[PDB]
Enzyme design. Sequence first.
Site, PDB file in Angstrom:
ATOM      1  N   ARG A 191     -10.493  10.511   1.980  1.00  0.00           N
ATOM      2  CA  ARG A 191     -10.087   9.121   1.794  1.00  0.00           C
ATOM      3  C   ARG A 191      -9.340   8.945   0.484  1.00  0.00           C
ATOM      4  NH1 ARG A 191     -13.732   3.510   1.158  1.00  0.00           N
ATOM      5  NH2 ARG A 191     -11.923   2.116   1.625  1.00  0.00           N
ATOM      6  N   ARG A 223       0.803  -1.221   0.000  1.00  0.00           N
ATOM      7  CA  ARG A 223       0.000   0.000   0.000  1.00  0.00           C
ATOM      8  C   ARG A 223       0.838   1.274   0.000  1.00  0.00           C
ATOM      9  NH1 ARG A 223      -5.533   0.634   2.726  1.00  0.00           N
ATOM     10  NH2 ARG A 223      -5.769   2.927   2.826  1.00  0.00           N
TER      11      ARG A 223
HETATM   12  N1  LIG Z   1      -1.114  -2.969   3.198  1.00  0.00           N
HETATM   13  C1  LIG Z   1      -1.609  -2.329   4.265  1.00  0.00           C
HETATM   14  N2  LIG Z   1      -0.814  -1.525   4.953  1.00  0.00           N
HETATM   15  C2  LIG Z   1      -1.309  -0.898   6.002  1.00  0.00           C
HETATM   16  N3  LIG Z   1      -2.549  -0.994   6.449  1.00  0.00           N
HETATM   17  C3  LIG Z   1      -3.389  -1.803   5.778  1.00  0.00           C
HETATM   18  C4  LIG Z   1      -2.923  -2.492   4.658  1.00  0.00           C
HETATM   19  N4  LIG Z   1      -3.936  -3.219   4.174  1.00  0.00           N
HETATM   20  C5  LIG Z   1      -5.004  -2.998   4.955  1.00  0.00           C
HETATM   21  N5  LIG Z   1      -4.680  -2.124   5.952  1.00  0.00           N
HETATM   22  C6  LIG Z   1      -5.494  -1.595   7.024  1.00  0.00           C
HETATM   23  O1  LIG Z   1      -6.521  -2.516   7.369  1.00  0.00           O
HETATM   24  C7  LIG Z   1      -7.784  -2.111   6.796  1.00  0.00           C
HETATM   25  C8  LIG Z   1      -8.297  -3.186   5.802  1.00  0.00           C
HETATM   26  O2  LIG Z   1      -9.362  -2.659   5.063  1.00  0.00           O
HETATM   27  P1  LIG Z   1      -9.324  -2.810   3.425  1.00  0.00           P
HETATM   28  O3  LIG Z   1      -8.275  -3.822   3.038  1.00  0.00           O
HETATM   29  O4  LIG Z   1      -8.991  -1.476   2.803  1.00  0.00           O
HETATM   30  O5  LIG Z   1     -10.800  -3.305   2.885  1.00  0.00           O
HETATM   31  P2  LIG Z   1     -11.279  -4.506   1.863  1.00  0.00           P
HETATM   32  O6  LIG Z   1     -12.692  -4.909   2.205  1.00  0.00           O
HETATM   33  O7  LIG Z   1     -10.363  -5.698   2.010  1.00  0.00           O
HETATM   34  O8  LIG Z   1     -11.237  -3.972   0.305  1.00  0.00           O
HETATM   35  P3  LIG Z   1     -11.759  -4.640  -1.110  1.00  0.00           P
HETATM   36  O9  LIG Z   1     -10.584  -4.846  -2.033  1.00  0.00           O
HETATM   37  O10 LIG Z   1     -12.417  -5.969  -0.828  1.00  0.00           O
HETATM   38  O11 LIG Z   1     -12.853  -3.636  -1.826  1.00  0.00           O
HETATM   39  P4  LIG Z   1     -14.499  -3.658  -1.903  1.00  0.00           P
HETATM   40  O12 LIG Z   1     -14.950  -4.796  -2.787  1.00  0.00           O
HETATM   41  O13 LIG Z   1     -15.068  -3.843  -0.517  1.00  0.00           O
HETATM   42  O14 LIG Z   1     -15.030  -2.225  -2.526  1.00  0.00           O
HETATM   43  P5  LIG Z   1     -14.697  -0.654  -2.140  1.00  0.00           P
HETATM   44  O15 LIG Z   1     -14.728  -0.486  -0.640  1.00  0.00           O
HETATM   45  O16 LIG Z   1     -13.328  -0.286  -2.657  1.00  0.00           O
HETATM   46  O17 LIG Z   1     -15.827   0.333  -2.827  1.00  0.00           O
HETATM   47  C9  LIG Z   1     -17.111   0.388  -2.263  1.00  0.00           C
HETATM   48  C10 LIG Z   1     -17.983   1.376  -3.086  1.00  0.00           C
HETATM   49  O18 LIG Z   1     -17.660   1.263  -4.492  1.00  0.00           O
HETATM   50  C11 LIG Z   1     -18.789   0.838  -5.244  1.00  0.00           C
HETATM   51  N6  LIG Z   1     -18.367  -0.149  -6.209  1.00  0.00           N
HETATM   52  C12 LIG Z   1     -17.525  -1.171  -5.891  1.00  0.00           C
HETATM   53  N7  LIG Z   1     -17.321  -1.914  -6.986  1.00  0.00           N
HETATM   54  C13 LIG Z   1     -18.020  -1.377  -7.996  1.00  0.00           C
HETATM   55  C14 LIG Z   1     -18.164  -1.737  -9.322  1.00  0.00           C
HETATM   56  N8  LIG Z   1     -17.556  -2.803  -9.865  1.00  0.00           N
HETATM   57  N9  LIG Z   1     -18.937  -1.011 -10.115  1.00  0.00           N
HETATM   58  C15 LIG Z   1     -19.559   0.067  -9.586  1.00  0.00           C
HETATM   59  N10 LIG Z   1     -19.470   0.476  -8.325  1.00  0.00           N
HETATM   60  C16 LIG Z   1     -18.692  -0.248  -7.503  1.00  0.00           C
HETATM   61  C17 LIG Z   1     -19.669   0.305  -4.428  1.00  0.00           C
HETATM   62  O19 LIG Z   1     -20.999   0.562  -4.904  1.00  0.00           O
HETATM   63  C18 LIG Z   1     -19.457   0.957  -3.045  1.00  0.00           C
HETATM   64  O20 LIG Z   1     -20.290   2.108  -2.887  1.00  0.00           O
HETATM   65  C19 LIG Z   1      -7.415  -0.823   6.050  1.00  0.00           C
HETATM   66  O21 LIG Z   1      -8.379   0.200   6.308  1.00  0.00           O
HETATM   67  C20 LIG Z   1      -6.046  -0.463   6.666  1.00  0.00           C
HETATM   68  O22 LIG Z   1      -6.222   0.375   7.816  1.00  0.00           O
END
Ligand SMILES: Nc1ncnc2c1ncn2[C@@H]1O[C@H](COP(=O)(O)OP(=O)(O)OP(=O)(O)OP(=O)(O)OP(=O)(O)OC[C@H]2O[C@@H](n3cnc4c(N)ncnc43)[C@H](O)[C@@H]2O)[C@@H](O)[C@H]1O
Length: 214
Positions: free
Chosen positions: A167, A89
């Site tokens: 963000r 990240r």
């Molecule tokens: N390497 C690192 N170093 C340090 N700290 C770390 C770290 N890794 C993790 N951390 C820490 O630990 C935490 C882990 O959390 P984190 O890893 O950030 O969350 P996550 O659930 O694992 O992320 P995803 O890849 O699964 O994404 P998503 O499918 O949920 O969609 P998104 O949210 O992007 O989007 C949601 C929105 O987008 C829209 N949307 C999503 N996809 C689509 C699409 N295909 N088309 C249209 N709209 C869409 C949706 O409608 C929705 O409204 C972090 O906060 C951090 O503090």
Amino acid sequence: RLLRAVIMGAPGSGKGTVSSRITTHFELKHLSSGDLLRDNMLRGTEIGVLAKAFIDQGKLIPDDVMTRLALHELKNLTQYSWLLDGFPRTLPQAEALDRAYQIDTVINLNVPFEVIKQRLTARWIHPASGRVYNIEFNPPKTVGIDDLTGEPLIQREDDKPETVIKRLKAYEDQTKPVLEYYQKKGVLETFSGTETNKIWPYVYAFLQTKVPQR
Ligand SMILES: Nc1ncnc2c1ncn2[C@@H]1O[C@H](COP(=O)(O)OP(=O)(O)OP(=O)(O)OP(=O)(O)OP(=O)(O)OC[C@H]2O[C@@H](n3cnc4c(N)ncnc43)[C@H](O)[C@@H]2O)[C@@H](O)[C@H]1O
Ligand SMILES: [Cl-]
Ligand SMILES: [Cl-]
Ligand SMILES: [Mg+2]
Ligand code: NA
């Protein structure tokens, strides 16, 4: 040649959907930093309790802690092809990974800021009933108003434009240096678009040349 790959993309870019499709369609292990952190927090491991101290306060895991945890899991995947998702990240994370494993492919999903912002600010709620509205997919019949009561809709703090802008700026500050690092290494492949289903076919075709399908 086993795949060593990373996927990158801003929140709301569709990276989650693209990663889920790569994992369905190809014979590889998906290593999501968030999933790994959550598994450790759920089990109460030493690094899970430390991770929860930061996450509960809205803080990133320190680079050294996160790298430790990711490299430990990668040791258990060395006989498989893998896809890293959420790690690295930050530039120190990418540099530390470079000292551990040869990374041959980095996929970036390049979706415009205004598109991601609209996606991330689309949700509105009617608080008393819990009814959800999405102005893109399920708008109310009257703007800003609940369909059954006529009462106002609100946004939750994490969905407000002010919060989403902070963000996205933080994400860009953290990851733009990582993208530039991988571009310099010659391993970055960029896919640009505004709709996940229009981007996916090109990612799929690119990976077909690199790792076996299931
Ligand atoms: N390497 C690192 N170093 C340090 N700290 C770390 C770290 N890794 C993790 N951390 C820490 O630990 C935490 C882990 O959390 P984190 O890893 O950030 O969350 P996550 O659930 O694992 O992320 P995803 O890849 O699964 O994404 P998503 O499918 O949920 O969609 P998104 O949210 O992007 O989007 C949601 C929105 O987008 C829209 N949307 C999503 N996809 C689509 C699409 N295909 N088309 C249209 N709209 C869409 C949706 O409608 C929705 O409204 C972090 O906060 C951090 O503090
Ligand atoms: Cl996403
Ligand atoms: Cl929604
Ligand atoms: Mg995911
Ligand atoms: Na509706």
